[PDB]
Each structure stands twice: as structure tokens, then as C-alpha cells.
Amino acid sequence: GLPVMTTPGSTQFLTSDDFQSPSAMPQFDVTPEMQIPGRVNNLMEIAEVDSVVPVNNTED
Amino acid sequence: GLPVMTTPGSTQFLTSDDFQSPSAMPQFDVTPEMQIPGRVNNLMEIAEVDSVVPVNNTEDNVSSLKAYQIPVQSNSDNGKQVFGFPLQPGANNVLNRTLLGEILNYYTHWSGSIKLTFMFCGSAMATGKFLLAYSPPGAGVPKNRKDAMLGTHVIWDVGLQSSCVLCVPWISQTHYRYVVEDEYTAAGYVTCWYQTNIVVPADVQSSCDILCFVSACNDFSVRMLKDTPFIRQDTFY
Amino acid sequence: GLPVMTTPGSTQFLTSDDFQSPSAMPQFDVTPEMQIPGRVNNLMEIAEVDSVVPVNNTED
Amino acid sequence: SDRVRSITLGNSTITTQECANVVVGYGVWPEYLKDNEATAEDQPTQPDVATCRFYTLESVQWMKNSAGWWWKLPDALSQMGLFGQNMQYHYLGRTGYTIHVQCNASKFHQGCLLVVCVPEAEMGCSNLNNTPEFSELSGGDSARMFTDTQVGESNAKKVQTAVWNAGMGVGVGNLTIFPHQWINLRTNNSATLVMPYINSVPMDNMFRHNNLTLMIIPFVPLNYSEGSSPYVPITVTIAPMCAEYNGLRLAS
Amino acid sequence: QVSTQKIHYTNINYYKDAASNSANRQDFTQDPGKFTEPVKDIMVKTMPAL
Amino acid sequence: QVSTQKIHYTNINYYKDAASNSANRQDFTQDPGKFTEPVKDIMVKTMPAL
Amino acid sequence: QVSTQKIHYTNINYYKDAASNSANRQDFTQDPGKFTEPVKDIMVKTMPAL
Amino acid sequence: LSITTPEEMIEKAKGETAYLPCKFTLSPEDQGPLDIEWLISPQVIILYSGDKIYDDYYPDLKGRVHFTSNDLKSGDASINVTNLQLSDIGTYQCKVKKAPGVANKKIHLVV
Amino acid sequence: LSITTPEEMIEKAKGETAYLPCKFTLSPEDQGPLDIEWLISPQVIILYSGDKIYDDYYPDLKGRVHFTSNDLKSGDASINVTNLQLSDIGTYQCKVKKAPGVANKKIHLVV
Amino acid sequence: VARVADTISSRPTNSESIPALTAAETGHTSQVVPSDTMQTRHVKNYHSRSESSIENFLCRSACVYYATYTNNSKKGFAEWVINTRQVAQLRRKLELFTYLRFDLELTFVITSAQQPSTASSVDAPVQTHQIMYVPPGGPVPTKVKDYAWQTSTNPSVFWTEGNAPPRMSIPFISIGNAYSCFYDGWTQFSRNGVYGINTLNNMGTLYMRHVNEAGQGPIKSTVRIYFKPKHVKAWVPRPPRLCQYEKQKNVNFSPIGVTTSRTDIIT
Amino acid sequence: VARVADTISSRPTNSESIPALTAAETGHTSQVVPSDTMQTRHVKNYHSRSESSIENFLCRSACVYYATYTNNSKKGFAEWVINTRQVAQLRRKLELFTYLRFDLELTFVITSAQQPSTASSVDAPVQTHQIMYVPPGGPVPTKVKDYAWQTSTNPSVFWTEGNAPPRMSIPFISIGNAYSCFYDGWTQFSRNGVYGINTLNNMGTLYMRHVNEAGQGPIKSTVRIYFKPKHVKAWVPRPPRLCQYEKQKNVNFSPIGVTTSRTDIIT
Amino acid sequence: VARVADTISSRPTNSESIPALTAAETGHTSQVVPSDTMQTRHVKNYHSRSESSIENFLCRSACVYYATYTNNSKKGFAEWVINTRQVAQLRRKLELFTYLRFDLELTFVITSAQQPSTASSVDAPVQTHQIMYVPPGGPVPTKVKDYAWQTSTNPSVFWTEGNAPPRMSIPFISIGNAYSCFYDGWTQFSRNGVYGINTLNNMGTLYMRHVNEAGQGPIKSTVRIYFKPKHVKAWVPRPPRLCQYEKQKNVNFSPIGVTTSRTDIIT
């Protein structure tokens, strides 16, 4: 019978929260990963790649 | 399945609570701080700063710069009163809008002593002496120079220097005092009398003026934070 | 996401309970105490004090 | 003694026989930008003798029925030689000023001034709907003045120049919380302040942001007997210190 | 933190004040020697009071 | 983690950010020496200012 | 278990799976050397490309 | 709020001036606007609302009543009843209401 | 949104062209579709909704008003009032509404 | 442990040390124990005086005041100055001492009651109440639809129905070093005006109101306030109040006999 | 501990070291203590300046803005740009400084109110509200029945009645190194247009709406928003605002005397 | 820490090492830094690329699909195959990569709405919903009053109104080693039939229904489903989708210009 108090901010669903959750299928063994080439790890590995600029729009 | 029990005081929103909260944007990297000069760290670094006192209100010198000039002229008779006002630094209509006043008007209990710097902004050949007295409460206001020199007082002389800091002491039964206008915790009165007349050479004006500042000593403190009674609002802007 | 269960006896206000509570004014510095004479510490320091007994009531 | 000072910068010098101490900002002395705080991606330029000197603004007359004066600081030096010239070709730039105001009188006059340098002074218009235009908010090394009467309402884009509110809607007495000095014609002759760079970003443009304001408000008005000099002028001379700029471009 | 009861029991303080802690209930100390015998000279039981 | 109050009290951080911690309430430090005396030469109390 | 945040913070795993743990949010590692310079011979900056 | 004497007995002769005092002090917990009333039970006879006086309410007493002090916001609600007559016997209620306090004074005038 | 001058006084002579400008800038928090109105208080006189103009609303002013700039989505809502007459005295309201901001301009024209 | 003292054995003596006769004039209460006037057996005593201490005698909640305020009305809202003089079951427990010092633990038990509505198909959602605390000197609201409520930095609490009653803790807020449950002496140096009134124990007001609007039918509510003196220390005990209280300010009373009477002195 | 300094004893001196006379021209405030102009006793001082610090002065929630939106209507939903200029009880506490830096803790107190329905036997289940936060630049919804609400990656919170009020925390989101409560200078290099407007403190909008549908009778709701500046640091103090605010954008005002007046200089 | 690199000082050189001229034919993007074409100052850089990582870019919930089902009707119940192709605000964030691998965190936001009942004095208790998950291949129910609902060993969740929205976690359920957001190639060895259809990402269905009965008046409900890809790893990036989607199965589109146009090349 531990005493607790519920602070404001309970029973709400924040769109960008990170909490644990009960598993739907327990003891599911996923398939082992494969060394697929071309692994991105940060979207700043895409800003480094050149791309032509449409700098002659001129409406036609 | 831990067993818990919910104590009274749950699912409430206390206006002045301190709890943790889930972040809205995780892993936000704030911009690094900069050593900006003039960092305040305690609102008692503002009560230490002098500010002129509008001690000449008179219902028409208020809507002008004349509220801060104290009339001092070459009298004929000796022992006249220059000014005088009760000392309630949160309720009086003189020490109210000074820089000490808008810091006191957020708290309720204060303490400590108060300094009162005066500055003779007159001519350069004129002299004189004034008696700055602070009579603790219990009786009325002093009415004769013979009466006010019984309390605590300094006998100011004007020379090369141009100031004299009457520091009202902390003489009170309670460890604090209310900032609202009360009667159980009055704080006395402040007066200022002619010690000797104001004499001047020829071809020099006889109407001089005096400014008066106010501040707190290094043992000031406040308590019991509230909101100010000065700023109103009817609809949003 | 700790799992808890609420036992009976929750969301009740017992008149003689002792729990902690959120402060209304935080960091309030109380005034220091004073050695006021005559400090009672147990109501059995009052039963020890004599008091005359009205043992002649007689309705008048 | 303890009354004389001798300030020198670049190739100019200021000497005063009678004056009070010098108030140095919020306790910091103006210096260049450290590299922990720098944000520009390129290298800044530092003239360091061509700009760091004493420019002298125009004069103002202290009549008996005077009200006040104000200058917007990194705007008043817009036309003073190499400072104004480097203020145009670049895009960023930080400075730190050494303001000095000087008004001398005999031993038979009386008066007092409040030399305050309010940072980030935002002013309010006469009409509650509009905002003051640029022409009437500042002038090139020229002194705009306060008034003793409340400005009327039918004016479209003007400044509310009621002096007992300092134009900012704040009580005029509480202005002493900013760095300041009192020009008191009894004992004082000159007031001097050393104001560092106060802003929330390490550098900024200088044509769009007047991040200081030097105000002068006569508390005890000037007064004299018949015979003495009826004309007492005031003159302020400002001097940048530790200036540097970035981002060359065309003139503008 | 951990103390005895009327076995043991555990108490932990959460908030950062002093007026938020629970009641004490365990300040058992008395001294009637200032209400019963507030006299200057000591009074012995056996010998007469005069 | 465990610190003193206005006895002791215990605080534990749960979330993995910095803007989620509770208020500090305990940064007691002041230095009016930059608002009261912002002058270049030191001013001694006793000796006159000039 | 206990690690640093953006001071410290404490995390405890309760359920007996792996897809129940909270998000990681702290895998800070990048290597653009496979998208920017995917060439066979090394290219030095200063010397010309041919 | 607090009145110094919530009720008393006053005696005056016909043709004199009747002093019906009403003093009070202000506790710290009072910060609202001021309101002062005056009743009669043989009906308002004079009001003080918004720092302005409204006192033409009782036709039997026209001009025969007016406040004394010039500092009505300091604890003075007394009225100057002049030219006492025989139809002026009745209990008076000095009802002052400053948020959030209230206090009364029952002046039973007999002649 | 913000208009440069929410109200002013303009004076022109009868038979001239009347310039009633309406400038604005766009804060970052504005990303909705654009809407610009024009009122008169002696009633819409010209609209700009969906990047197309609808301006046949006031029979007294037919063709006597038309926008000036060719970049109406850049901060130009000014109108070119031509051939001023005596029945054209009245206050104008340049009501621009871009989600989620709103700003007006009260042009009181006198002749 | 706070155990009471046991009793020690005795034997029939015949000596000149009389413990019975003493002098009650000296204001010194007797100190004899039954082992000094008769033969007693050595009885170990395990009784404990724990449940008679101060914190076991005072730290129990007690209703102080309760007000009602209707929803469908202008300025329907309750104010109350904070004082313990009003309820008598708690007032008497605090008069046993003169100078108390404690911190507090409020608790509000808010209830509602549907009023005689007149329209058809009345249905209202859950309600939300606000309990605003104004220190002595702050600005006070005048009506419910006012801007002193939201735009304020006073301590307030928001609560909605169907949950646990709210509760906040208040530390020792006073000017002196103890609350004075008695104060003989005027409050003006001229010795006029009210008699037993003191600024030492003032605590402010309490403003409460609804947060919802008037949907279709009025709702009168009710709030009850409960104290709980903790960490208490008492000084200078005092005899208990006998005559019935009559007012909340002073200690006025009407004289009444000491005790109820019996038929004869020997019965 | 932040204790204040005690006072040291003194003796009646007669010397050439005058602490009283100084020069106020130097802009250097006095530094005397009562022990230098009179005889004082050595008083240990235990007072503490803790409850006057910055984080004890600002970290208290204050209502900022509140809007209403009906259920049974098209585009019944509330928008609001995030700014503290609108309420005056909090605006004035933030003008005392020029450059502030704090992270935030919002809190929404949502209430409902049944509208004058017309059908018979009206009964609605519990309601659910959504409070969507759009950064500056994102796409904004146009009506309630729109697909910018669900299919979005902005931070939003879902809340239903009868529970604790929602609350999220927002870190220091700005372009510079401090929020600027004042900014003198235009925003166009040509020095035209609005005067005191800055991109430095923009924070986006807030869109709120119902999630249920129109069952049988309209329901107007109401949401109140509460700030709480934490971890705050203040720079360059400033005198307090005297004249009454008139607008939310600029600092316009009407001139008003410095203080209320008295009858004579000696009273 | 993931800090960005600072910039180093430079001096005006005159040499044969040209960093500016390179050959873009080699498909090798440039690698110059401003310190190589102008004079720069040594600027310490504290910026961090943390809030641009993959798990900070994807792990944010987004509505996927929402259906309605009336109470007072036969077979009033909602079915849905599990796929992310339907909503476009989330579809586009998953097309930036080709082979993703993540475990999921669903969340259902169920609401109700009272329908236009006809009887008098309608009053219903709280409702209870069931959200049944059928793996690919299991038996599917045909109506609400069916015995495939209770007597089943599939993962389902029971939820009642007025509480927190339910939430379950689903691990990486696939046949290959990554979900394929694209698959060029038919699904029959004869190269007939549908074009871009793959068994690799199938996840089953979702059946939802009421648990209560028809008391007196119909109740239409609504359920919204929210994804949250955690532990995600992405492979083979891809340019972002430009033309507007038209179907949920294939990638059909109508051709549209590359960018919006301007008046002239020099403006």
C-alpha cells in the first residue's frame, strides 16, 4: 500500500513521448539482420550530396 | 503489479508546484550562452540602487519634474520645517513609485534598514546646515525643532561634498513589517529642519533646491511573494 | 512505464492521516524561534497541577 | 590630486581639471570578441586607430525652460569620418563607447543634469495606433529634445515627449538603475561613462538597431542672477572603442 | 530514514522544503518540574515543608 | 541526488533531457558590486570621496 | 542503467522483451564517406582531380 | 474592518446638533474599494460610493445631514445631524463595506 | 501581419488621383492563404481571394478603383482612386487576413 | 518510549518523616506516591503517555468554515478571511495555550448541487473549481468575469470533481515568533478603538469560483476547509474556556455557574 | 544559505573619518551601515534572502490567454500565436529585465459548457480535445474536418475530461542567446514599416479543436494556458512600467503623473 | 556528442595547390571548406547534429487511418488491413528510404458520439470497446454477435471511456530482413497481374466493435490509429516524392513541373 500522488500531466497522450509499453506478441524472435550496403545514419549524409538546381524557371 | 494508494491531493494543478514534465521536443540543442554584461541574480541587487523620491507632490507639481525638487530658500526666522513624511515604504504615497517601492509591492513582509541620501543642488557660494531627524512612532509627528532633535538625527553641513546619508535604523518589535497601510506596525516619521538659515552673497539666487534618494542597507530582506495592486486590465491587447 | 495497482482505500480523505504535501509557498524562511518560558510538551504536565474542587454545589 | 583626469584615444585627448570619477558600465571593460563566442564564418577587420577616437557632436543650449535631450548612439556617429564609412560598407559590427559630456559654469550659477545611457530604449508614439517614424526618432549627431507639455493626439507619427515619463512610459525618477552620472554645477564639471557592448547577439547590423540612447534630463533647472552669462552650452563627445566589422558588400 | 514503530518502517523525503514533511508523532519528552515545583529552594518529600 | 532542504530529501531524474528537470530554487548567490559601485577607482568608506 | 542527458538520469527496464524498451535517441554516429566520396582511388583536396 | 462601538445610547435635546460618530480602522487584509451607507428605522439617507457622495435620498432630511471629516477614507463616517426635531427617533446603521470586510454600528437615537 | 500606419489623414483636391496605400510585412508564423478586403463607411469595394480579383461590388465606384502593384502577395494592398468627387468622403478599412494573422488600416479620406 | 514510573514495595514504618502533611501555601503541588502512605506491591508498569502528547492531540483535521456560491448569477463566488475563531470545536483546543507555533495543511472538500432548472434536457459536464489565495495586501477580485483571477502570481489550485480532495501545505507565516491566541491591549497608541485585535496572526483571504460557464441550469456548490496543525509547539498553558462564546472577535460571554449542581453535599 | 550580514558594535568616536558625507555625483551609491552613524549592539541576524531570488520570483504559473470554440459549427476551433505581451499581470514581471533566458512548462485547463440545445433527451459522452502546436513555418489547418490534423508530425497532446490538466515542457527555442523583451530599431534595412518587431522570440501557433462529432446539442469549450519560466537567468535590469499599456505590439501609452499626490509637503 | 567541426584560420597564400577547381564528372562531390578560398578566423563551433538523426526524425506518432461504426445496427464494426500507404503526411517520410527496419508502438484514440435517438429519457452507461488483431491467415469475424471474438487466442485489448488511450507494442514482424517501401517486379512467375505488390510487409487486419448492447439510442464511435517507428535503421536513401499521390497500391501520378516559376532568370 505505497502512497502515491498523481501530478498534472497524467492520462494524456503526448505525440512525441518515449515510454515503455507492454508487448503484443511476447518472445517473438525477429529475423537476423543483414549487412545491406548503403546505410544512412543521419539526415546530414544527404545534404552532402550534390543535386542540380533549377535556376532557369522562366515559366516555360 | 506493485500496490499503490492515491493520497488526497491528486489530479490537482497547484499554481506554484515544481515537478518534472515530458519534453515536447526531445534532443533539442539550445544555443550556447554568451557572457552578456549586467547579470542580476537576486532582486536585492535592485533595492541597493538609489532613485530620487517624489517628495513635493502638492497635487500640481506631480505632472512635471517639480515633484523631485525640495524648496529651500533664505528664510527670515530660524527653525522652520523643510519637509516631512511618514515612513511606510510600500503604502505611503511618496516612497511608493521609487525603485524600492516597486520591489516591495511584490512582497508583503520586509525588514532591514533604509538609507536616505540627500544632495544639495544649489549654488556654489551658498552654505547652511540642516537637521535630518527620524522620530520612531508612539507619539505624533514632531512639531518643533526642539522636539525632533530628541530622536535620532544628523546635523548636516554643506561644503565641498554635497551629500549626507541619514540611515534610518531598524527599530521594531517584530522581525518584519507589513507593506500595506497598517497601524500595529508603524515605522515612525522623517523630518528635516533648518539648523541655520541659508545665506548667500549678492547677485546669487536665494531659491535653492535639494534632491533626495532612497535605498536599502546590506541587511534588507523580503518574504511572502504576492502580486502588485498597480496594474489593471479589462480585455486582452 | 512502471506497472502499479491501486489498492482499496484510494482517493479518500482520512481525517487523521499523516502524509506529505506540496508546499504552497516554496523557500519561505520562517522567523527564528525564541526561548519563551513555560513550554508544555505533554498534556500530562497539566494534570499534575492542583485545582480547587467545587464540592459544595447545593444548587445555590 | 584626485580631481583631474586625462583620457586619450587614437590621436585625440580629453583633459578636465575638475571632474568626478569615471563609471565603467556594468563592471566590464570593452574588449574584442573571444573565439568561444564568435559566430561569423570569416575574419573581421580592425582599424583600431582610424575609428577609436573622440568625435564631437553638435552643441545644445541650456535655456532656463529646458526639458531634455537624447541621442541614439550608434546612429549619431553615422557621418563622422572613418567610423561612418566603415559602418556602411560592412554588414555586422560591434563597438564599445566612452561617452563624455561636458558643461561648465561659474560659481554663481546653479543647476544639475542626469547623464544616463539607457540600453535598448524603445520609445512610444503620440498616437496609440501608430509608431514613431525614423525622421523624428533620431538625428545625425543632432539632439532631439523632450518637452514639458503632453503632445497632442491629432499627430500621426510623432514621439510622446512628456519628460516626466522619459518617453518610454517609465517613471523618470527610476532611471538611475542604469549607469549614470550627475552633472552638478556646484562641484562637478564633466561626466564620463564607459559602456561595453550590450546585446543578445555577438554582432549586429548598425543601420537597423540603435542599441543605446544617451539622455540628458535637467532635474534642478538652470538659474542665475542678472548680469551673469545667459548662454550656457552643453557638448557631448563620444568615442568608440574596440570596434570590428564583418561581411563586406557594396555601399548602401 | 529507517526507524522503529509502535519491527521497522521506512520513510523517504521527496519535496525540497521543511513544512512538507509528515507529522513527527514521536517527540516523547516531558518535564513537569517547571509546573509542579516552581520554587526557589528544593523541597524534599519526607521532611516537613517548614 | 540527495541534498538538504530548508534533514534531507531525495531527488531522482527520470527523463533523458535537461528542460524536464524540476526548478532549481537553490541558486543562492548575489554580487551587487556591479550595480552599487560601478566605478574605476576603489572608493573607501571612511575617507572622503574627493 | 544510469547515463547522462542533454547531470544524470536513471532508466530501469521492466518488461522481459526487447521491443518494449523506450526509444534510443542517443545513437550519434555518422559517416558520409560512403555517399560523398564513393570512388576507388583516394581524392586529395589540394592537388587537381586529373 | 471594525467599528469602535457597535451600539450605544445617545441623548440630545430638541433644537441641538446631533453627533452620531462612526469610527473604524483597516486590517491589512482589506484592499478593495470603499463603501459607506447610513440607514434609519423609524431607508438610505446618505451614500459614499466611488469617492463621491450621493445624499438626496430621505425627503424628511434634506441638507439636515452631512459628513464631518475631509478624510473619509481614513476611518471617519460620522454625520452632523442639525436642528433635532421629534420625528427623528429611530435606530441608525452605519454600514461600511470594504472588500472583503464588513462592519456596522447601531446608533439608537432617543430624544 | 502588421500594417505600417493603422490610421492617418489624407487630403486631396477634387479631380485628382487619390493614393490610399496599404503596406505590410509577413511574420514567420504566417503560412496560410492570402485574403485582402477594402471597406467604406459613408460595404466591400474590391476583394482579393484565391489570387484572383473580384471588384464589382460598389455601384458608385465602377472602374474608379484598382490595385497598383503586380506583386500583391508581397505587401502591397494599395488602391488607385481616380477622379475624386464630393461623395467620396468616408473611412476606409484595409482588412488583410492571412492565417493566422490579421491587420487593418483606417484611412479617413477628407476632401 | 515515554513510559510511566512503576511502583516500589513498602513496609509498615513508624518514623518522624511524614510525607503526607505538607504546606499547600507555597504554591508547590504535592509529590507523594501511594507507596508512601500504604503498603504496595512492586508492580511493573508498561503504560505509555504517547497518545497524550501535543502532536497527537492537535494534528487532526477539523472543519473551519464553509460557504456556498451559485453558478448562474453575477459575482457568484465565495470569499473568506483566514482565521480559526469561527468554529468552536477547534477554537477551544487552541485556547488551552497562549503562544502556538505550527505549519498548516489545508484540505478542501468541494461538493455540488443541481438547482431547480427550468429548461428541458439539462445536462452539464464535469465542473472545475478554482481556490485563489490572496496574501494580506494583494489585489482582490470584484466579480467572477475579472482579470485578477488568471493574470496573477498568487498560489491557487485547480480541481475538478470526482477526484481526491485538493490539499496544500502552508509554512509558519507570521511576523513574531508565535501565533498569539490572546492579546490584551489596544492597537492604537492612543488606546482607542477595537480591543483584542492583532496583526500577528493575519493570513490573507480565500477567493473561490467556478471555471465553467452557465450552460443551461444553475449549480450551487459548497466548499469545506480543514486545518491540520503540524510541527506544533505550545507555550504558557491556560485554563479551558467555560462560558459559551458569543462573538468571533473578542471573548465576550454571559456569566454561568461553575458546575451543574447536586441535591446535597453528602450525596 | 544566503544569509544577510549582522551588525557590529560601535563606540562614540570623534575623528576625521566621516562616513556620512560623500559625493553622489560619482554615480556611486552610498555604502554606509547604521553602525557608522550611531551606537549599535551586536545583533546576530538570521534573516535569509532566499525567497527573493530570480527563480523564486518568476517560476510561478500565470494565465496568458484563453479562447472559446463551439462544437456544432463549421471551423469551430481556436488558434493563437505564442506571445506573452497580452496579459498584463505577467507582462510587467518580464519587463523588469531586458534579456531573459528560460525554458517553459505549459499547462492547459480545459473546460466545457453545454449550449442551449433544442432536441429532447440530450446526452453526450465524455469529450476529447486536441491541442496542436505548429512551429513557425509549418502548414496551418483551415477547418476542423481537415487532414493536416492527424497526418502530422508536430507535437500535439490528446486530453479527455475529468482528468488532470495536461502539461508539456518546451526548451529554450530561439535564434539568439536570450529572448529580448525590448528591441529598439526597425526590421527592414530601409527603416520603414513596423518599429519594435523581432523574429528572435517567435514560437509558433497553437491550434485546438474537438475530436468528437456533433451528437445532438452544441458544446462550447474553453482553454486556459499557463506559463512557468524555469532555469531562468536575467540580464540588464530595467525600471518598472508605470503608464498603462494600450497595445500588444508596441509600448504606446498616455502620460500620467509620477505618483498620487498629497495635500502639503510637510504632512 | 555529434559535434560539427570548427573552422581553422588561414593566411593569404599564392601557390599551385588549387582547392577550388575540381572535376564534377567523377561523381565525387566537392569537399572544400570556406577556410580554403578566403581568410577565416578560428571559430569554435558548438552546434550539434543530434536533432537530425534518424530516431529523432521518425519516432513521432502520426495518424494512419480512422473508421466509424454505429452501435444500433447489424455488423456495426470496423475492419482495416495494416498498411502505411494511406495517409500522405507519413507515407512521404517513409519513402525517403528503401529498406526500413523498425518495431512499432500503436495507439488508439477512441471517441463516441450520440446519434439522433427518438425515445425519451435516453441514458447510457460508460462504453467498452474491443480492438481485435488478426494475423494474416487467421479466421475473420462476420458480424458483431459472433463467436470468433471471445473464443480466440489473438492479441486484443479491452478499453473503456474516460481513461488513457490504449497502447501496445509490436516487434519486427516480417519475412525478410527489412520492410520494402518499394518493390519493382511482378508477383507471379509468369509476369502477369498486379505490379508492385509484396508479401514482405503484410501485418494482418484490425477488427473493432462495441461490447455493450443497444440500450435505447444508437452510438456512433470513431477510432484513430497512431504509429511510432522505434529502433529504426534505414538503408539506401531515395529522393523525395514530388508528384501528388493518386492511389494507395502503386505509385501512379500526373506529370508536374519541377518547381514554381519566376519572372526572369536574373530576378
UniProtKB/Swiss-Prot annotation, chains H, I:
Example of a GO MF term: beta-catenin binding
Residue ranges annotated for the Ig-like C2-type domain, each copy included: 1-108
Example GO BP: heterophilic cell-cell adhesion via plasma membrane cell adhesion molecules
Glycan attachment points: N80
GO cellular component labels: acrosomal vesicle; adherens junction; apicolateral plasma membrane; basolateral plasma membrane; bicellular tight junction; cell body; cell junction; cell-cell junction
Subunit structure: Monomer. May form homodimer. Interacts with LNX, MAGI1, DLG4, PRKCABP, TJP1 and CTNNB1. Interacts with MPDZ; recruits MPDZ to intercellular contact sites. Interacts with JAML (homodimeric form). Secreted isoform 3, isoform 4 and isoform 5 can interact with the extracellular domain of the receptor.
Protein name: Coxsackievirus and adenovirus receptor
Gene: CXADR
